[PDB]
Amino acid sequence: GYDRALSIFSPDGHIFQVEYALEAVKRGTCAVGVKGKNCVVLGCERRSTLKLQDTRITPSKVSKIDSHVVLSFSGLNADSRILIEKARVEAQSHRLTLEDPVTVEYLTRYVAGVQQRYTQSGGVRPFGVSTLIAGFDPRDDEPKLYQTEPSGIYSSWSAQTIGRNSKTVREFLEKNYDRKEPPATVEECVKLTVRSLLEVVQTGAKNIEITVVKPDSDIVALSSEEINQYVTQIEQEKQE
Amino acid sequence: GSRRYDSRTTIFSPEGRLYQVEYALESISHAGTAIGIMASDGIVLAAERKVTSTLLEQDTSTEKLYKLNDKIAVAVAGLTADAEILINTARIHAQNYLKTYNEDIPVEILVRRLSDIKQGYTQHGGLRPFGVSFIYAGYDDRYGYQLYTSNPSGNYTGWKAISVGANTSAAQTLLQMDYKDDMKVDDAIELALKTLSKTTDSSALTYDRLEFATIRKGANDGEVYQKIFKPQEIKDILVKTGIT
Amino acid sequence: SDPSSINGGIVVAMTGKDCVAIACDLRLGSQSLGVSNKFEKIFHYGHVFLGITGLATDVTTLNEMFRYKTNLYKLKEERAIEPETFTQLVSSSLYERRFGPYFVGPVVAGINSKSGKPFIAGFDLIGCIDEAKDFIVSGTASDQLFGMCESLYEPNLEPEDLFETISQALLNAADRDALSGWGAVVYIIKKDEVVKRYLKMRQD
Amino acid sequence: TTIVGVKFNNGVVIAADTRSTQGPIVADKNCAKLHRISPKIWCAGAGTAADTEAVTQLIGSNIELHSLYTSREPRVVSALQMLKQHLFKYQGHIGAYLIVAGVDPTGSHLFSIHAHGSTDVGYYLSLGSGSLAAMAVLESHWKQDLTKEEAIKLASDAIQAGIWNDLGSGSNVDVCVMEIGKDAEYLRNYLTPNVREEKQKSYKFPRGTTAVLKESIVNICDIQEE
Amino acid sequence: MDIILGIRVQDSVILASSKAVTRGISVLKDSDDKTRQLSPHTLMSFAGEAGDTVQFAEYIQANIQLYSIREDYELSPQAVSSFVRQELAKSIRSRRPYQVNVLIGGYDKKKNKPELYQIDYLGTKVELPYGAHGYSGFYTFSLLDHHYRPDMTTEEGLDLLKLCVQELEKRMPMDFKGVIVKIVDKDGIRQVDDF
Amino acid sequence: MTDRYSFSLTTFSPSGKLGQIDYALTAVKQGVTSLGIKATNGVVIATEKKSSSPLAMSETLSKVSLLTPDIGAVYSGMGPDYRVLVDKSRKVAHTSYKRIYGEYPPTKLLVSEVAKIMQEATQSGGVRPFGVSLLIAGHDEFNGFSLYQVDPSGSYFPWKATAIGKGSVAAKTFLEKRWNDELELEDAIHIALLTLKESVEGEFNGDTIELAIIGDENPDLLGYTGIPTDKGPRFRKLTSQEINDRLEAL
């Protein structure tokens, strides 16, 4: 149909290539962000069911853009490699010219700008990745959560999920989290993200990856034994 | 669905899964088998040749195996025509990096950059994806011996052992079944020869149908020594392993 | 001071029977300030040896340059770098900056692997391909060195004789140069193997 | 630098000295100055040494390209033309000044080419800084329709006047005689004034005169796979 | 100003870097230390002409940072110093050169080795026991040749440094207004208690 | 007929094998039967020429062009693609090896550079593959006599023996039966004539048959005698008369 054109504006008002991007986000891993008062917890699936895989050199889904800016993603791994690279360069650009450390909010916009640009320029596909960019603003200790979409726009939610079986996760996020009050403690906040991920992973120590990002360049990924500890405690409740 | 659209990379399939990429899989698999086994004491690269004519000189062609630099070698499977652009760029890029920092290229770097051109041709430019898979065999001191594979799509995944091109599934079922976790380098050669004889039409696995190289950390005083074995040393070791 | 002679340095090569030698002093100075007692400038690509004199930053540049180009040669053609091809290669580059030439003196020494034929060749700033097989000299104190090499050298020297001859040539010029004096290294290069000898000589 | 060109009836003979200097120091005892544009088009080069070799190499290829393209041996004038334009562009900074000689199916020629871009034809020409000396012989003895034999004497004798008067002229004289219908007869070392003479006294050093502080043996040789 | 010093000791690399910024005949500032932190284990001090100083130093900083983050791997100090030499080897042939002398100290964490590279303006990099740049350096090269021994502890490295400082102030008509001395070692980068 | 994907050269074919590349092979077949036989001490290449019009001169139709004086080429296919490709081979080689390394290419390197050109007339969309497949037979010092095929795809392979064109089937089997590399060159020339003689029997006269050897140097054809060290031309093209001599030796 109109899938062969981008320039052609379409009376449907909807260019099919754009629709098809969404199909692509769905297929990918589930990646979730839930934020406290002092933390972003990012719980994400990393598949590891692959036989004869040396896990050490296989890239973790989470990639440090900046020293305090992180990215998780759902959608095609190849296409996603371009966003990570543009975004890294721009990170260091920011410091080189403003001196100021990376404004996260600029960065959210910069990234979306690329998925937008390519919607207008024929002969350049719109990317079929949606991302989570999360960070902490210069001179600030309030957590910051953003999602980008392949529609070439951006938005902030109090907590959000993307990728396979996101429908299932969204019910959890409505009932156990609230915009009004995020779980004040870091600890509360991490335990709920583990329970959400369990709904679609259905038991895995390394299939669940938790990276907690705190203010002031504090990045630490939870220990496999500690992750295992969240699971067992939760699993006792399930039969009660 | 019905009307399959795929003229350009930019034009999406209804499915959303670009058919040009799909056709790329077929092509890879067209070519014979290549196999990389990473061992704790070397890497072994062993493959059955594409060519089969005796008139055509199989012996002087190591179509599968080219070295890019002193530490890094690649096994190639797919489209010969397309492939030739990428092997050449990869050598120059490696030497560009050595110019800059006066250190050997890290394995991980060299793959990620090449994968990114492969994406480049779908991201922009009608230009077909250059549908080729390499198995990279390299060494760096960041992670030791490292093995990678690259998808035509333009993404990579590490592996403990992998097979590419034709009959990937059969060779894969055997490797995992008898896998020895530690892996000795002597062992890897034996194990490789067993897998190829079962997937190779000649079940006597003639030498003239074989390409072989071994990259060894088990080379004196703890160093990395790449050695391309000629058809005459393949033949001597064929009689050592006893298939003939 | 033209940029080459800020850093000077010397290279002296001779052929002998089934061998070549390439030798240099180890003094690195910039003007009045000597900077390092120990500093190398003879590198090897395969069995082919290249020492390079002159402006130090340009030395480093060209060394990288040639390392890059020679890598491709051995990979594509599927044979070791020869001295004969290599002499042309050094020449080609040098000419591309006609105007403002590289401020260097390159010296090739190596043995053709196809007949054992001892080969040396030299170069100046501007890419001259000097074919003297007797001896080749280069640096600031090139003039001094030529004068040693022309009296001492004789056609046909036994390997062990050639080692003494070149060493006295390098050493006495060194002490009649300013920008040399500190230590020495001789490469005696034979088809079978390389012996590399750090000498003991007077030091300022 | 003394270079001569003499037409003779059934061809042309070009000669120039082998001795090369870089400044007032003699760089090379012998190294011929006569360069091959093609098998029957030879030239001898004066000026900046580096430029003369380089231009011959670059132009060489195009001439070779011409030859094969056309399945025909290029004209002597064709080389002349192509050479002239190249130099002209840079307004002579590329400082090759050359005697262009050759035989071709058209006939025998002798031209000079300068870096500025000026040309001449001569029956007999001389180039280098020893042009003045070589010519003087030529102009005093040359007659119309010299034999090949006679051209070769007049020529060699003329180079001798260069040798003795110009410091940079010296050692063996090398000659290339290009004749109609025949492979150029390169007469290597036609003339020899004298050569290197062994020094009266020996400068052989007993071993152990050199002192050896340390030793490290390099292995460019292949470490075992074992 | 015209002085940057470095001394590579047993178990560390010690850098001392001028505080004076003199822009003509007036000392506009007497305190700012002319250094940029490239890594927690790598420090670059710098000196040269007005304008070129700030652009270059920060351009280098950015490049090393970008590298560092991309692969999550701190590049060897050996690699960092090569980086800078090339950028300069380009500059000097270009339209506009960058005339900046730098001492690159890094403590290789893994090989537990201090390493100090002297890269003078040209793009002549050498690895030495000890180095300096500018005319200033001449005076002090003697005290370092004589009193240096490999076995000098980090602490003994400070002591020799004060004696060099004193000599520099005496015979230079221009005082460089004292030095901020920082230690690049396995702990990371720390500023000496006193200076 | 075929797909719009397969006509395009910027578009991955369904099969992944272009229609295009396959057209180039159909045309190769349609042309002359050209062969190459490798010997210990030589290479012989030999082919028949188009008879063309009666009053068209046969001599001027040349299916063997010397690339360098020591390395010749032979093709099956169309004239126009042949000549353009041929100027490109020489030209790219001068730049990348006669000025850099100031010498003639190894045979391997020249073969490598010819593949790359080929490859680019297949990569760029809207530019058809070279209409011609080569044999590049040659001699260089380092790797001795050498024998190659270069495909319009831009893949190349060394052989013991190969033949191309309509009569490729016939010829290859004949060479096998009668010869092996270890045999001398002199025998192969007689053999090659016979092989080509199956192809056509109406005329086999040395006018319509172009036969050449790459073998030993000819220090006569160096053309600037008096210097011996320079290799003479390896290639020597054998005249019609010379062919006729070689026909009475058969």
The DSSP line for A143-157 is EEEEEE-TTS-EE--
Q: Partners for E (CB, 8 Å, 3+ pairs)?
A: A, B, C
Neighbours of F50 (CB within 10 A): 13
CA–CA distance, A54 with A52 (Å, rounded to integer): 7
Q: What topology is assigned to E1-195 in CATH?
A: Glutamine Phosphoribosylpyrophosphate, subunit 1, domain 1 (3.60.20)
Could you tell me if D101 and D38 are in contact, meaning their C-beta atoms sit under 8 angstroms apart?
Answer: no
Amino acid at F134: L
Query: Is residue D1 flagged as an active site residue?
Result: yes
* Contact yes or no for B67 and C75 at CB 8 A: yes
* Contacting residues for A79 by C-beta, under 8 A, at least 6 apart: A24, A127, A128, A129, B119, B123
Of E62, E63, E69, the CB nearest to A64: E69
C85 and F108 within 8 Å at the Cβ level: the answer is no
Retrieve residue C201's tokens: 């000589």
| HSE-CB of E115 using CA atoms within 13 angstroms | 19
Residues in chain B within 8 Å Cβ distance of A124: 10, 123-124
Partnered with residue D3 across adjacent β-strands are D16, D127
User: d(Cα A233, Cα B10) in Å, to the nearest integer?
Assistant: 49
Query: How many Å apart are CA C8 and CA C145, to the nearest integer?
Result: 14
Report residue F88 CA to chain centroid gap.
16
Show the tokens assigned to D115: 């870096």
| D53 reaches F (C-beta below 8 A) | no
Spell out where chain F has E strands: 34-38, 43-48, 64-68, 71-77, 132-139, 145-150, 156-158, 161-164, 209-214, 235-238
Residues in F closer than 8 angstroms to B81, CB to CB, are 21, 119, 122, 153-155
Residue B61 contacts C where some CB pair is shorter than 8 Å: no
Size of interface A-E (CB pairs under 8 A): 22
Asked if F100's CB is within 8 angstroms of C88's CB, the reply is yes
- Three-class SS string for B17-67? CCHHHHHHHHHHCCCCCEEEEEECCEEEEEEECCCCCCCECCCCCCCCEEE
Please tell me which of the candidates F13, F159, F176 has its beta carbon nearest to residue B56. Answer: F159
CA distance readout (Å), E48 to E94, E96, E121: 18, 15, 9
Q: What distance in Å separates the CA atoms of residue B25 and residue B136, rounded to the nearest whole number?
A: 18
- Tokens representing residue A190 in the block: 């991490």
Task: Domain of residue A58: give its range.
Answer: 1-240
Give the CA count within 13 Å in the CB-facing half-sphere of C130.
28
Q: Which residues contact D177 (CB under 8 A, 6 or more apart)?
A: D11, D12, D13, D148, D152, D184, D185, D187
> Do the beta carbons of residue B165 and residue B28 sit within 8 Å?
yes
Which residues from E are below 8 Å from A96, CB to CB? 58-59, 62
Domain that holds residue F214: 1-249
Please name the residue of chain B whose CA is at the shortest distance from the CA of residue F36.
B55
Residue B174 backbone phi and psi in degrees, to 5: -65, -45
Provide the domain count of chain B.
1
Task: Judge: F106–C89 Cβ closer than 8 Å, yes or no.
Answer: no
Q: Is the dihedral of CA A10, A16, A18, A22 positive or negative?
A: positive
Query: Alpha-carbon distance F69 to F231, whole Å?
Result: 10
How many residues in chain E?
195
Alpha helix (H) residue ranges in chain C: 3-7, 56-77, 83-96, 142-152, 159-175
Chain D partners within 8 Å of B236 (Cβ): none
| Residue F1 C-alpha, separation from nearest chain D C-alpha, in angstroms | 40
Q: What is the CATH number of the domain that holds F173?
A: 3.60.20.10
Could you tell me how many residues make up chain F?
A: 250
Q: Flag if C68 and B69 touch (Cβ within 8 Å).
A: no
The Cα–Cα gap between D107 and D77 comes to 11
Domain CATH code at residue B79 = 3.60.20.10
- What residues of C are in contact with residue E92 (Cβ under 8 Å)? 57
Nearest chain B residue to D223, by CA: B220
E70 touches chain A (CB under 8 A): yes
Question: Which residue segments constitute the domains of chain D, with CATH numbers given?
Answer: 1-222 (3.60.20.10)
Ordered structural domains, chain C, with CATH = 1-204 (3.60.20.10)
| Cα distance between residue D8 and residue D150, in whole Å | 8
| 3-class SS of residue E179 | strand
Chain D residue with CA closest to F219: the answer is D183
- The first and second tokens of residue D18, run together, are 């082998």
Distance between CA atoms of residues F242 and F190, nearest Å:
12
Provide the shortest C-alpha distance from residue D191 to chain C (in Å).
20
CA distances to C93, D40, D153 from D179, in Å:
37, 9, 16
Residue D25 CB neighbour total at 10 angstroms? 11
Q: Which among B66, B95, B102 has CB closest to C71?
A: B95
Exposure class string for D42-71: b at 16+ Cβ within 10 A, else e: bbbbbbbbbbbbbbbbebbbbbbbbbbeee
Alpha-carbon dihedral sign for residues C133, C139, C143, C148:
negative
The structure tokens listed for A222 are 């939870």
Q: Which two tokens stand for residue D157?
A: 């004798």
Q: Which amino acid is at B160?
A: K
CB count within 10 Å of CB A131 equals 28
CATH of the domain at A8: 3.60.20.10
Q: Please state the separation of Cα E172 from the chain's center in Å.
A: 20
> Who among D60, D69, D184 is closest to F87 (CB)?
D69
The residue among D220, D222, D223 with the most chain C CBs within 10 A of its CB, best to mutate, is D220
Chains E and F are in contact, defined as 3 or more C-beta pairs closer than 8 angstroms: no
Residues D143, D9: Cα–Cα separation, whole Å: 12
- In angstroms, the CA B27 to CA A182 distance is 52
Instruction: Let me know if chains B and C touch, i.e. at least 3 Cβ pairs under 8 angstroms.
Output: yes
Judged on CB neighbours under 10 Å (0-12, 13-18, 19+), E166 is exposed
Q: Positive or negative CA dihedral for B99, B104, B107, B108?
A: negative
Residues near B1 by beta carbon (within 8 Å), at least 6 away in sequence: B14, B15
Nearest residue to C41 (alpha-carbon basis) of C61, C24, C65? C24
Cβ–Cβ gap D220/C194 under 8 Å: yes
Distance in angstroms (rounded) separating the CA atoms of residues E29 and E165: 20
Separation CA A17–CA A4 (nearest Å): 8
Q: Are F110 and F9 in contact (CB under 8 A)?
A: no
Contact C152, C165 (CB under 8 A): yes
Contact between residue B28 and residue B164 where contact means Cβ atoms under 8 Å apart: yes
Structural domain range at position B209 = 1-244
Experimental method: cryo-EM
C103 Cβ contact list (under 8 Å, min separation 6): C2, C3, C4, C54, C55, C58, C125
Burial of residue F169, with CB atoms counted within 10 A of its CB: 0-12 exposed, 13-18 middle, 19 or more buried? exposed
A89 near E CB under 8 A: yes
